[PDB]
Amino acid sequence: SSSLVVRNLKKRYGSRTVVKDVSLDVKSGEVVGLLGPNGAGKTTSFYMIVGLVPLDAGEIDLDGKSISLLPIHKRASLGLSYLPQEASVFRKLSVEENIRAVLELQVGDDGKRLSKDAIASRTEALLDELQISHLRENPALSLSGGERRRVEIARALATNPSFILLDEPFAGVDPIAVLEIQKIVKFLKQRNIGVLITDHNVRETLGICDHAYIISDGSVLAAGAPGDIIENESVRRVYLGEHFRM
Ligand SMILES: [Cl-]
C-alpha cells in the first residue's frame, strides 16, 4: 500500500494566483478525481502533481519521500506514471515492440536490467492482461483509439507504477469508449494501483471515482465520495447547477 500526499499547492503566474491552496491524498487501489470549473485551478494543480509545473509553494510526498522538486522521469522511477491526452507510442513500432522498448530500459529491485527471458515473459503477460495479444505484430499507427489506449496502459504498466495520473481520458470519446476506459480504470484499481484523474466530463469521471475534489477559486471547495459531492450546495452553485442529475 502506497500513498501520494499533496499539501497546500500554490502557483502564481505574474500578478495572478491560479492555485491558492490545494491539498489531496491518493492511496493504492483508490480512484480519485480532480474536478471543477475550467481554469479554476484543477488543471494547474494536476500538472504540479505530474511535475510539468513547478510548485511556488507546497509539498508532494510519495511514500513519505518528497518529490515536488523532482523531474518527471525521476517521479516515474519512483512509481508515478503519467498518461497524457495526445500520445505516445511509437507508431513505426509494433504493439509488442512498443512494450518491449519500455521493459528493455527497466532496472530490477536487484539493480539489474531484465534478462531476455524476463522481458519476453512480461511482454506476454501485459499483452494478455490488456487483451491485446491479437495485436502484437500490428504497427501502432494502425490501431483504433481504444486499442491504442490499451497499448499506452501496457507501456505505463511495464514501469511497474504505484500511481497512474490520467489527463482528460474522456475528452472527445464516444459513450462506448467511456465504458472501455472505466473498465480499464477498474482493472488498474484491482491491481492495487492508485489512479488520479482530471477531466471535464463530470458524470463519466465521478462514475468511477472513490473520492473527488472540487477545485474552485484556486482552492478545494469540497472533497468526498461522488454521492456527497453532488449534493453539496456550494458545488451545485458554482459548478454542477441546481438541477444537476447523474
Ligand atoms: Cl486550472
Short synopsis of the structure:
With 246 residues, this protein is α/β, with parallel strands linked by helices. It has nine helices and ten strands. The structure holds chloride ion.
How would you spell out the order of helices and strands? EEEHEEHEHHHEHEHEEHH
Domain module count: 1
> CATH class, anyone?
Alpha Beta
Total of DSSP H or I helical runs spanning 4+ residues = 9
Named at the architecture level, the CATH assignment is 3-Layer(aba) Sandwich
Number of DSSP strands?
A: 10
Gap between N and C termini: 32 Å
Which superfamily, in CATH terms, is the homologous superfamily? P-loop containing nucleotide triphosphate hydrolases
Strand order of the largest sheet: 6-7-8-3-9-10
Helix content: 25-40%
By secondary-structure content and strand pairing, the structural class works out as: alpha/beta
Largest sheet: 6 strands, mixed
Rg on CA atoms, Å: 19 Å
What share of the residues does DSSP label as strand, in percent?
Answer: 25-35%
Principal-axes geometry comes out as globular
Organism: Paraburkholderia phymatum (strain DSM 17167 / CIP 108236 / LMG 21445 / STM815)
InterPro entries: AAA+_ATPase, ABC_AA/LPS_Transport, ABC_transporter-like_ATP-bd, ABC_transporter-like_CS, LPS_export_LptB, P-loop_NTPase
GO molecular function: ATP binding; ATP hydrolysis activity
GO cellular component, one term: ATP-binding cassette (ABC) transporter complex
